[PDB]
Amino acid sequence: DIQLTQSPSSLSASVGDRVTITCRASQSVDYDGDSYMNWYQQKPGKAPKLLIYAASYLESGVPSRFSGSGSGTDFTLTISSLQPEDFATYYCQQSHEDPYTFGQGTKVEIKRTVAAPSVFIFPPSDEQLKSGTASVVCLLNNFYPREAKVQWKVDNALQSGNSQESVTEQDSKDSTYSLSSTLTLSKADYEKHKVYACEVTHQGLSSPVTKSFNRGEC
Amino acid sequence: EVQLVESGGGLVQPGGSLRLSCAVSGYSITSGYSWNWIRQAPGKGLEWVASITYDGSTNYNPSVKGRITISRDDSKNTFYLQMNSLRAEDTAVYYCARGSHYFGHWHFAVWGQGTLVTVSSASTKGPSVFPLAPSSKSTSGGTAALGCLVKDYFPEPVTVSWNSGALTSGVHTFPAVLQSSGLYSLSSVVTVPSSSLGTQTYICNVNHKPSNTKVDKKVEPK
């Protein structure tokens, strides 16, 4: 088959900056003057969206800041001025021969200014507790950059190995991320302790932030 | 306008078969140059697997050919994907897509929403929904966060909306995590004015189609 390799696999650029993504094909996708390379944009949870076809044609309805160039085995997708809405994974795709093949994709993020997270902590509900399990949830809202550290403490004992976290995709509204961390304990363990704390470390925080509650007092 | 709506997704046992359908509306299926199935394994890239052209000619990706059938039903304005002998490798979101009459044909301008097929031995399990109650009291009377914890379900996906879709601003619905139990857990939060906690009703609407579980959870100050 025709193998497509994109570069880079990942990039982060300041809003408004020029962004170029390249695609190299293992064989030529040229046919009678035309170059059958296509570009797609895929945003979180959505189907890919066609941006460019036949190497350089802008698909109807797509903003003019997207353009394509190249021929033979080498192609370039250009975003003239990166907009917040342009966070996505970008794919090249050859349509010269079956099987029609895609590049591995290039992740594009907008590099905005540093923003500290707003931190919230949630006790387990009484409803859940009767099931025998306690989930303690810590929310880190609207921060940048994506890298953040959450430390769980139960009566000042550092919790390790009993939590999981999840991060949203970049929000085009403000180019920030949010993060959710869940501490899971048995009901019995939860009832044996008083102070539950979520300690957050982040670049936008001059020193770590801690949110806590005392079990029983609500 | 043209819309492609896929059905048939969900849980399939290894060795089992899948049948997907793509119902086309706002367009005659007979007028498309070609109709296609393209799939995407979780966190991975895209793979074209099959096509049918307007004259009925079929084509398959050799990476799966020999256990795959694309077909159409003109009178229902629908086309189908049949695969059997499913393996774990076949777990993916499957998209239907339309090819073009122009410029080499095999680029795809119109896509379905995609449907997730999960190949697994495990059985379906509906989620428990627990409140993430706000505040106790606000910090400076500014912005409060509340949410829903959607715990212990299988397979993916679940959808969460707030106030039947009338509350979208400030909503974050996080990627599910896979627990060591083999069950998924997900949280959805929303940030709201803390001055509205006494007067505004907040309800998370949770839907887990594989288990036919729908839940509406009112979340309020504890």
Basic shape of chain B: elongated
Main β-sheet description of chain B: 7 strands, mixed
How many E-type strands of chain A? 21
Inertia-based shape of chain A: elongated
Give helix and strand order of chain B, one letter per element, not per position.
EEEEEEEEEEEEEEEEEEE
The tally of structural domains of chain B comes to 2
Number of strands of chain B: 19
First and last CA, distance of chain B: 47 Å
Plain-language structure description:
The complex is a heterodimer of chains A (218) and B (222). With 218 residues, chain A is mainly beta. Chain A has 2 domains: 111 residues, Sandwich (Immunoglobulin-like); 104 residues, Immunoglobulins (Immunoglobulin-like), CATH 2.60.40.10. Chain A is 4% helix and 52% strand. Chain B has 222 residues and is mainly beta. Chain B folds into 2 domains: 121 residues, Immunoglobulin-like, CATH 2.60.40; 101 residues, Immunoglobulin-like, CATH 2.60.40. Chain B contains no helices and 19 strands. In chain B, strands 2, 4, 5, 6, 9, 10 and 11 form a 7-stranded mixed sheet that branches. In chain B, strands 12, 13, 15, 16 and 17 form a 5-stranded antiparallel sheet that branches. The termini of chain B are far apart. Classes of the chains: A mainly beta (218), B mainly beta (222). It is classed as immune system. Keywords: Antibody Fab Fragment, Anti-IgE Antibody, Anti-inflammatory, immune system. It forms a dimeric assembly.
